[PDB]
Ligand binder design. Sequence first.
Ligand SMILES: COC(=O)c1[nH]cc(-c2c[nH]c3cc(Cl)c(Cl)cc23)c1-c1c[nH]c2ccc(Cl)cc12
Ligand SMILES: *[C@@H]1O[C@H](CO)[C@@H](O[C@@H]2O[C@H](CO)[C@@H](O)[C@H](O)[C@H]2NC(C)=O)[C@H](O)[C@H]1NC(C)=O
Ligand SMILES: *[C@@H]1O[C@H](CO)[C@@H](O)[C@H](O)[C@H]1NC(C)=O
Length: 540
Amino acid sequence: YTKFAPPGKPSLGWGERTFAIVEVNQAATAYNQLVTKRDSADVSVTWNVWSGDPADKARVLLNDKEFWSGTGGAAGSASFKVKKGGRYQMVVELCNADGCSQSDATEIIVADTDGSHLPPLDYNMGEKNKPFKQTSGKVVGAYFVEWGVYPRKFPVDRVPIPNLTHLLYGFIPICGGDGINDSLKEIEGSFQALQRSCSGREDFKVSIHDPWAALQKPQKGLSSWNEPYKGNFGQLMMLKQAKPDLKILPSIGGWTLADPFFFFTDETKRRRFVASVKDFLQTWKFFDGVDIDWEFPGGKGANPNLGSPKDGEIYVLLMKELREMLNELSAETGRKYELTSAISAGWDKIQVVDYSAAQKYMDHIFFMSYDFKGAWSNDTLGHQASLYAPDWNEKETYTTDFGVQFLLAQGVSPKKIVVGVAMYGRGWTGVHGYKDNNPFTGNATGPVKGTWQDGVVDYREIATEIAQGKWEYHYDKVAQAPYVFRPATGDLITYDDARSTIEKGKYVRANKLGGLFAWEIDADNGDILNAMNMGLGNSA
Ligand SMILES: COC(=O)c1[nH]cc(-c2c[nH]c3cc(Cl)c(Cl)cc23)c1-c1c[nH]c2ccc(Cl)cc12
Ligand SMILES: *[C@@H]1O[C@H](CO)[C@@H](O[C@@H]2O[C@H](CO)[C@@H](O)[C@H](O)[C@H]2NC(C)=O)[C@H](O)[C@H]1NC(C)=O
Ligand SMILES: *[C@@H]1O[C@H](CO)[C@@H](O)[C@H](O)[C@H]1NC(C)=O
């Protein structure tokens, strides 16, 4: 027999069970109205004990740990702060002199942008993708484009996440209107979309180009009306829960979004940009750093009126300040962050920047060893992304080897250079007047018919049409590049195939390079990424 008379069992009342440390407005189009970051969520609970002692003490426990303590024996309420997300069992405990009573547990969801409230990303390998283990110690990266979820129908759950070390999210824009983002006007709707997203936001801060695709679009596993984070961002959160070692990096800029970088001669603008990136990574915690895609320091990007030789020093200062920011962000969060950047592979742009001074702040350099040739010229036909120079033009300097050796000659560490691999072909039509049975000696009359844009064809479609006998396949074994040709219509396409990719992986290994990366992940049927893993020595 004992003297044990604890209070009655508390009954929890009906209440909100879903909370968010980072609040997202599912019906907003402008970034400043779309997301509100805080450093904790506010959880509330009410309980009732029919004829209880209001002098009893009360405690709220989340997963058997105390988050609140006060008084409130007979009917009470509590409000408290939760700083880390997850699914919690909430219990109200009441105590008197004798003992304690415990509520039935109720589940609450505290959402945060590190995916702590979400299950791991469900994936099955599709098409020709085969599973690999990341045992080589090399970078195996790939770009995921934000707009690939519309007619391409490539959401994040189609990414072969076992076969990657890095996922680069293209693209994060920089706020700015006329004069600041003029390059965006070449894409229909793209400039006006940024202006809506940047509505009321200061220029030269990062933002989100398409808030619908990024956060509000229903995706696999994220379809409920009251899911805080859907779209690409919610799926990348679940990806981190499935592969915590896979680095997910946001890429700021690209071809049509690099114009604002040229104004960073003003340190005031550069300081605002860096501060917005710090705020950006605190808001979207699944990101593991920053990828800077400025195309290009000195010019010769999409805007023909931008560029200056002083861009090289601005680039080095930007990297110094971004790392300093990531250093203080490490001090607050205890995490390790990566600073990377995609740079032109052409010597005439490499020369602008002193990368050996910039490489001390950076983890990787994604060497854009592609787009060496394309349908922006009718008369200059060649390999888009070959390893070496071809036979008929041994002095070609736009090759993977020539650019790598030029960057190496600057004193850049070979373990930071990651060689680019093209998951797409660039092509011409109506090629005529060529000698020696070599279609590259002729001229085109225009771009080849493409998958989504004129002059560019997904590797998935190049492969399918080859199997269907719609192409004459050739492999230049000197330049280590494939191409398909159609003698009747003059259709020519230069691309990367499993063979040139493996040859690039052999070059990376032979010269002690950082690895391989590809643009863009959705144009692959699996053959190219498989070759990257095999070419770098990963385990199947
Ligand atoms: C696909 O997205 C892009 O814009 C893009 N990404 C990387 C490059 C690019 C990769 N290595 C390069 C090396 C040199 Cl030396 C130069 Cl100059 C450019 C590049 C390019 C691109 C350049 N010129 C273009 C013209 C039209 C189009 Cl569609 C694209 C490009
Ligand atoms: C490639 O050559 C073609 C023609 O051989 C050029 O297209 C012509 O030029 C302008 C461009 O719109 C048109 O007014 C003519 O009607 C075009 N003729 C054709 C092709 O039908 C084309 O501009 C060239 N491409 C480049 C970038 O030089
Ligand atoms: C293609 O155009 C260039 C323009 O300079 C010319 O030199 C070249 O001969 C042309 N090719 C053919 C096959 O006519």
